[PDB]
Amino acid sequence: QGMIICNNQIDDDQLKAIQDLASLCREHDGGTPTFYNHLLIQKRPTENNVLYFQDNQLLGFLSVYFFYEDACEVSLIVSPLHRRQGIAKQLLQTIMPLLTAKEMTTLIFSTPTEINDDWLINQGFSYRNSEYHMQRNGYDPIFMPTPKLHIRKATEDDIPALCAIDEACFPEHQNMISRFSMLLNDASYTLFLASYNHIIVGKAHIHWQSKEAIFSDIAIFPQYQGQGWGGELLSYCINQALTSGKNKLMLDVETSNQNALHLYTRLGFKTANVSDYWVIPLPQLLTNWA
Ligand SMILES: CC(=O)SCCNC(=O)CCNC(=O)[C@H](O)C(C)(C)COP(=O)(O)OP(=O)(O)OC[C@H]1O[C@@H](n2cnc3c(N)ncnc32)[C@H](O)[C@@H]1OP(=O)(O)O
Ligand SMILES: CC(=O)SCCNC(=O)CCNC(=O)[C@H](O)C(C)(C)COP(=O)(O)OP(=O)(O)OC[C@H]1O[C@@H](n2cnc3c(N)ncnc32)[C@H](O)[C@@H]1OP(=O)(O)O
């Protein structure tokens, strides 16, 4: 009649039940929390997943991801048909001993936008940022009659330029020599470099999977931005992926203002999911939820 499972690895039947519950939530809520499926199905060091069943139906799911030194990210969903019955409190109560054993001090929850804003505010959660999970599902290419840039695959010889771009455009990173040495020697990644008048102006990364292409780390030096070069470089990458037979092109954009999306949506990407991220000190959550 009620069952709580805690494990360190989602199996195939559980993943399908979680995916169906997330789809039911998406239909009512307009979006979902961010789940990291590749971590769900890995054998993780601790029992980070919590499943709640009632009469053989999955009604709640929580997972925690230990991304930071003293904080973790939590993805939590409860069936729309069974809310305000304390299922999320049960899920959180179940994972709490582990959060304590890891001495977590703050929790970061991903949430669909808008529907929770009023009570998250009133309970002292703090809005941090948003993430737009974007997909381009058409197969039609970008028509570019007047290309301005020369674009080629980056090689090991380009690592100083790649690092220079990264330093100028991604302050939140900081040991990129080793990383680029790994990316440039891995058949599943293609790094593209953009040049204008024989000067390197920016770069973009494609990660190839069996059926998808993922774009990331797109960057143009600040002094060179706002001329259309970033859009042309992304257009080039789209057209490469289309000739490679992937039927899904994806990318994620972390931003606190929607204006950043214009670059991607003008080239056919659409918002497959949006999550906001909200942070709370753990002792505070304990008291507000008992
Ligand atoms: C901190 C977070 O939980 S962020 C959640 C992010 N996830 C999502 O938004 C996914 C979609 N939403 C859901 O799945 C759910 O509505 C959750 C997961 C938000 C709540 O699941 P539930 O099982 O309904 O929550 P539960 O019944 O345990 O309530 C716990 C407390 O949360 C608060 N709460 C939950 N839903 C609401 C709501 N709609 N309005 C106001 N407060 C709410 C209340 O404090 C509630 O305690 P109370 O009933 O004592 O006031
Ligand atoms: C999927 C991902 O790669 S997310 C990572 C995105 N990259 C970064 O945030 C690194 C810093 N940003 C940059 O390097 C550049 O701003 C880029 C690569 C995002 C765009 O380069 P640009 O040559 O300026 O692109 P372009 O000239 O075609 O147009 C800029 C558009 O991108 C958006 N944009 C501008 N600056 C930024 C920025 N710092 N971060 C994100 N988006 C931006 C704007 O909405 C703008 O559209 P507008 O014409 O309505 O103003």
Resolution in A: 1.8
Spatial contact of 166 and 158, defined as CB atoms under 8 Å apart: no
Nearest-angstrom CA–CA distance, 54 and 85: 12
Question: Which segments within 90-243 are labelled E, that is strand?
Answer: 106-112, 126-136, 150-153, 189-196, 199-208, 212-220
**Is the beta carbon of 263 within 6 A of some atom in ligand 2?**
yes
Q: How many CB atoms lie within 10 A of CB 214?
A: 17
Name the closest ligand to CA 168: 2
Sign, CA dihedral 79-80-85-88, equals positive
How far away, in angstroms, is 98 Cα from ligand 1 center? 21
Q: Are 65 and 11 in contact (CB under 8 A)?
A: no
Angle at alpha carbon of residue 107, lines to 217 and 282, rounded to 5°: 160
DSSP letter for 261, please: G
Q: How many other C-beta atoms can be found within 10 angstroms of the C-beta atom of residue 130?
A: 19
78 labeled binding residue? yes
**Per DSSP, what are the bridge partners of residue 77?**
61
Q: Per the annotation, does 220 bind a ligand?
A: yes
* Angstrom distance (rounded) from CA 57 to CA 142: 45
C-alpha 84 to ligand 1 mean position (Å): 6
First to last CA, the chain: 25
What the block records as the tokens of 105 is: 């001090």
CA 205 to chain centre: 16
Give yes or no on whether 2-134+275-289 and 135-274 have one common fold. Answer: yes
With CA atoms as reference, report the closest residue to 202 among 189, 186, 188, 218. 218
Give φ, ψ of 196 to 5 degrees: -140, 125
Residue 280 to residue 111: CA distance in whole angstroms: 13
Tell me the domain boundaries of the chain.
2-134+275-289, 135-274
138 φ, ψ to 5°? -65, 165
Architecture of domain 135-274: 3-Layer(aba) Sandwich (3.40)
Q: Which of 245, 185, 181 is closest to 213 using CA atoms? A: 245
Query: Method used for this model?
Result: X-ray
d(CA 139, ligand 1 centre) in Å? 40
Q: Is 142 annotated as a binding residue?
A: no
Query: Would you say the CB of residue 287 lies under 6 angstroms from ligand 1?
Result: no
Q: How far apart are CA 181 and CA 254, in angstroms?
A: 25
Q: 48: CA distance to ligand 1 center in Å?
A: 20
CA proximity to 169, closest of 199, 198, 203, 214: 203
CA–centroid distance, 262 to ligand 2, in Å, is: 9
CATH pick for 2-134+275-289 out of 1.10.260.30, 3.40.630.30, 3.40.50.450, 3.20.20.150: 3.40.630.30
The residues, any chain, with a CB within 8 Å of residue 13's CB and separated by 6 or more, are none
Q: Which one, of 96, 118, 108, lies nearest residue 47 by Cα?
A: 96
For residue 255, list its beta bridge partners: 130
| Whole-Å CA distances, 19 to 34, 48, 235, 290 | 12, 17, 32, 30
Joined together, the tokens standing for residue 271 give 């918002």
Which ligand is nearest to the Cα of residue 31, counting in written order?
1
Asked whether 220 lines ligand 1 (CB < 6 A), one says no
Ligand 1 atom showing the smallest separation from residue 84 Cα: 27
Q: Cβ(234) to ligand 2 under 6 A?
A: no
Rounded Cα–Cα distance for residues 106 and 183 (Å)? 32
Ligand 1 and 73: CB distance under 6 A: no
Spatial distance between the Cα atoms of 160 and 165, rounded to a whole number of angstroms = 9
